[PDB]
Write a protein that binds this ligand. Structure first.
Ligand SMILES: Nc1ncnc2c1ncn2[C@@H]1O[C@H](COP(=O)(O)OP(=O)(O)O)[C@@H](O)[C@H]1O
Ligand SMILES: [Mg+2]
Ligand SMILES: [Mg+2]
Lengths: 335, 323
């Protein structure tokens, strides 16, 4: 039996965490969740306990914390505090077109590896003189090498054939140029893999017109934020795609797009897919592959049936009907 | 009858300018073309180009080959507001059909401050600069644009959750202006969410106002929804009533003389130019003349079928004459 940290978060997090437990109970998953809560308090006591809880368990499942962006810069995104404190440097999402969820684009299969601890999320900011603010984007060789090493290893291990570095180095010559140089240093050790690069501007155009061209994509923090959401939106929105946050020792799992769902919370219409697919991602990490596969095949099987779909993907069903259907498809495996 | 400085530029630049000039004349447009050759000297643009612009106040720029000429022009004329109206074109069809978005980008500042440091070896610092003045200015223009172009909504795009001080200040200015202009409906939105919803349902958006890096990306994003840079108008607004309107695509050196080019985008930039001046009648007539030509869809360029740039241009002239 494994003990895993659970941070319910705000919005749809808690209600979906209940459904993850239902599914686990039903599937006889040998995983116990130690829940830890993160309030809106300006005091960082709650978030420090969450860090420590993760240091202990090394694995967490996580909802999104809402950030009130009207408060002072002292009050930092608890989400961002967690991944930097835990040094979960690699955000990984796999946006693959789902057969049952028809969108404008098909045959999408993108692995996005995003630097997760650095760049413009460094929270370095000052006002030199009244009405003049400087934000310090930080790019280092250590972290760019590290993320490129991951992206190339992932491609090699997944049987992928191309890595694409997304950047803005024609304008950010030193910053994004350094990141891009580290991708090339690593590329020299993976001659089996094709290395290309694309400016973040042009990438978004390519994603909305011909996203079949992309395979593995590797990039700094903010461009990752953009490409993740674009690619998520292409395959049918925020309810479908699971996100992973890997450090050397720790690992936290979440919905790829990282949304609260504040405005749909407590109305039994949130899409449980992304959250469930994340729990399976966590099970694979814990080496519980048989349970991961049972739940994942159940979840994906439900997506083929349009009657089970929730509003966010063109349907009319509730969360609980989708979970009912997921559980039915584990019954046929389970008994 | 007014004069407008003309920068045909390079490659296919002359052809598409010649096509835009001929359509403007075919449509009886009260415009004179003071042709001009922008180029780096000593670094400056030539005194004749500088003088043309301070005189005429209005310009048209074809694709310029490769500091950057665009960078140069920006600092010279204080071009602070990049505007890109993206609308779906019937006939040149994409998976996105309901599109009508204006991307309003702060153009001087933000992530493109040009300030980078090697703090220590293997550690680089890039400065994103957000000021009170520039943020207030690009806000005021966005609200002014919506009024003068009859738009209902203006959305401020940001990442203030992460970059509190900088994006929060930018956002602070957009709020103040919105309070002084309650006849336009104002909402805030995170860049990642905007991107997320844009690719699912782009009809939800109207006018997007934002800092430099977000605008640079979203403008290209939107442009990709409507079919690319080859069909996209663009306009830059400067200090004391100056404005350039460009073809934002490449010079296409392959087909420079072969007459396979496509003037649509520069034309639309010219239509946009006319609208800014106040010649709405001529603008709407040429715009409609273009859309109808594209809609027929047999006499299209390689960019398309196999009909030449001249046959396309003549088709515009044929129809625009018959209002
Ligand atoms: N699981 C989900 N199911 C349905 N809609 C969702 C889901 N997650 C997010 N959304 C919707 O996608 C958008 C995500 O933005 P949002 O919830 O506001 O995240 P955030 O609070 O982090 O900015 C919202 O429209 C939200 O209602
Ligand atoms: Mg969020
Ligand atoms: Mg651009």
């Amino acid at each position: 039996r494994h003990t895993v940290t659970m941070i319910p978060g705000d919005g749809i997090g808690p209600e979906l965490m209940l459904h993850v437990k239902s599914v686990f109970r039903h599937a006889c998953v040998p995983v116990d969740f130690e829940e830890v809560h993160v309030s809106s308090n300006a005091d960082e006591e709650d978030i420090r306990n969450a860090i420590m809880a993760i240091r202990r368990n090394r694995v967490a499942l996580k909802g999104n914390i809402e950030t009130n962006h009207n408060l002072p810069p002292s009050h930092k995104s608890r989400n961002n505090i967690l991944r930097t404190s835990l040094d979960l440097y690699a955000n990984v999402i796999h946006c693959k077109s789902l057969p049952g969820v028809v969108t404008r684009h098909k045959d999408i299969d993108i692995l996005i590896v995003r630097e997760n601890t650095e760049g413009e999320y460094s929270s370095l900011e000052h006002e030199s003189v009244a009405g003049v603010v400087e934000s310090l984007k930080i790019i280092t060789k250590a972290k760019s090498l590290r993320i490129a090493e991951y992206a190339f290893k992932l491609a090699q291990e997944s049987g992928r054939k191309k890595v694409t570095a997304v950047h803005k180095a024609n304008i950010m010559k030193l910053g994004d140029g350094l990141f891009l140089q580290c991708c090339r240093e690593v590329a020299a050790r993976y001659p089996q893999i094709t290395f290309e690069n694309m400016i973040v501007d042009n990438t978004t155009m390519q994603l909305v017109s011909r996203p079949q061209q992309f395979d593995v994509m590797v990039m700094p923090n903010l461009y990752g934020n953009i490409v993740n959401n674009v690619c998520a939106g292409l395959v049918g929105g925020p309810g479908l795609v699971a996100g992973a946050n890997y450090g050397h020792v720790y690992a936290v799992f979440e919905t790829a797009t990282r949304n609260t769902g504040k405005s749909i919370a407590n109305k039994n219409i949130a899409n449980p897919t992304a959250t469930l697919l994340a729990s399976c991602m966590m099970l694979d990490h814990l080496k519980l592959h048989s349970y991961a596969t049972s739940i994942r095949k159940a979840v994906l099987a439900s997506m083929d049936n349009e009657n089970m779909h929730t509003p966010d993907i063109g349907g009319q069903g509730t969360t609980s009907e989708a979970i009912q259907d997921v559980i039915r498809h584990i019954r046929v495996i389970n008994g | 009858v007014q004069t407008v400085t003309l920068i045909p530029g390079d490659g296919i630049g002359p052809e598409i300018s010649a096509a835009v000039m001929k359509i403007f004349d075919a449509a009886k447009a009260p415009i004179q073309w003071e042709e001009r050759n922008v180029t780096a000297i000593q670094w400056m643009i030539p005194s004749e180009a500088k003088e043309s612009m301070d005189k005429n106040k209005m310009g048209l720029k074809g694709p310029l080959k490769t500091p950057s000429m665009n960078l140069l022009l920006r600092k010279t004329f204080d071009l602070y507001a990049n505007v890109r109206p993206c609308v779906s074109i019937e006939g040149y069809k994409t998976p996105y059909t309901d599109v009508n978005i204006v991307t309003i980008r702060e153009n001087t500042e933000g992530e493109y401050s040009g300030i980078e440091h090697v703090i220590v070896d293997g550690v680089v610092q890039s400065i994103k600069l957000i000021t009170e003045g520039a943020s207030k200015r690009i806000a005021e223009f966005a609200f002014e644009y919506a009024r003068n172009n009859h738009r209902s909504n203006v959305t401020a795009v940001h990442k203030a959750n992460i970059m509190r001080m900088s994006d929060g200040l930018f956002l602070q200015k957009c709020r103040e202006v919105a309070e002084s202009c309650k006849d336009i409906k104002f909402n805030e939105m995170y860049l990642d969410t905007v991107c997320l919803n844009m690719v699912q349902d782009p009809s939800q958006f109207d006018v997007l106002v934002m800092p430099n890096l977000y605008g640079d990306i979203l403008s290209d994003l939107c442009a990709g929804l409507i079919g690319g840079l080859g069909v996209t108008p663009s306009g830059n607004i400067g200090a004391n009533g100056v404005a350039i309107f460009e073809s934002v695509h490449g010079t296409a050196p392959d087909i420079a003389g072969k007459d396979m080019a496509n003037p649509t985008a520069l034309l639309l930039s010219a239509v946009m130019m006319l609208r800014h001046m106040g010649l709405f009648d001529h603008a709407a007539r040429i715009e409609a003349a273009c859309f109808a030509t594209i809609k027929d869809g047999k006499s299209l360029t390689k960019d398309g079928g196999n009909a030449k740039c001249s046959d396309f241009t003549e088709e515009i002239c044929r129809r625009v004459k018959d209002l």
